[PDB]
């Protein structure tokens, strides 16, 4: 039982390389979330501000500039 | 030594399920990205579209407030 004992000894040594070989891809592609999506969340916030101010800027640009303008052009009266 | 293969049979078996179990999580994380990679394609457009015809109203609304604002200078002064 020399060749049988030795066989299992070299047998395990490859599957323990797969143990790293399959946690190698896992460690890498898991980092493909921690930065790629996390910053991808930020650009939404960055683009989010412009929908806050175009409403604020047009808040004065639509109401005030028409509460008095069309009042001023009441020359028909 | 006679039983030493019996102990080394289980590492030849246990390392097999660590191969079996781990690849399952590799199966899941792929669609945990791909399906999301279809979600962050629609969100940008559905968010950017609701801006791409907001400047077309921030301007054309001022067209009435500039093409008709040239008339007030005729009488105010």
């Amino acid at each position, epitope marked *: 039982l020399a060749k049988s004992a030795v066989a299992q000894e070299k047998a395990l040594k490859r599957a323990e390389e797969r143990a790293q070989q399959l946690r190698a891809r896992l460690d890498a592609m898991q980092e493909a979330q921690d930065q790629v999506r996390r910053d991808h969340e930020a650009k939404i916030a*960055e*683009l989010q*501000a*412009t929908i*806050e*101010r*175009l409403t604020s*800027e047009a808040a004065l640009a639509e109401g005030a500039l028409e509460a008095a303008r069309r009042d001023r052009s009441r020359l028909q009266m | 030594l006679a039983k030493s293969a019996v102990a080394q049979e289980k590492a030849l078996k246990r390392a097999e399920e660590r191969a079996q179990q781990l690849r399952a999580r590799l199966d899941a994380m792929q669609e945990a990205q791909d399906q999301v990679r279809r979600d962050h394609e629609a969100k940008i457009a559905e968010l*950017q579209a609701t*801006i*791409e015809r907001l*400047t*077309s109203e*921030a*301007a*054309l609304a*001022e*067209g009435a*407030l*500039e*093409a008709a604002r040239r008339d007030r200078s005729r009488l105010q002064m």
Partner: nanobody
Amino acid sequence: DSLRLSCASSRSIDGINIMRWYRQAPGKQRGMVAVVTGWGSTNYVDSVKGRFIISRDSAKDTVYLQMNNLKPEDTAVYSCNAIYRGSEYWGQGTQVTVS
């Protein structure tokens, strides 16, 4: 009649959501004239439909406008505009005159 305009920036390059262009009548108020955005969509103020063509370079950060076939009544005081992180930012300001 040959004329051109440009408005460059040296910092925060391409970190640009909606940014726009203005003109000022002397001693009068201020209003938009032309705009460009993230996707480069085309739209203007009604006064220049068929009059202005506006285009971007993402890298160099200097948007351009096409001014041709001018009419002496278009003269005003121009000052490019940009909004970063939701806050607006004006510059020095210039004029364009034809007469």
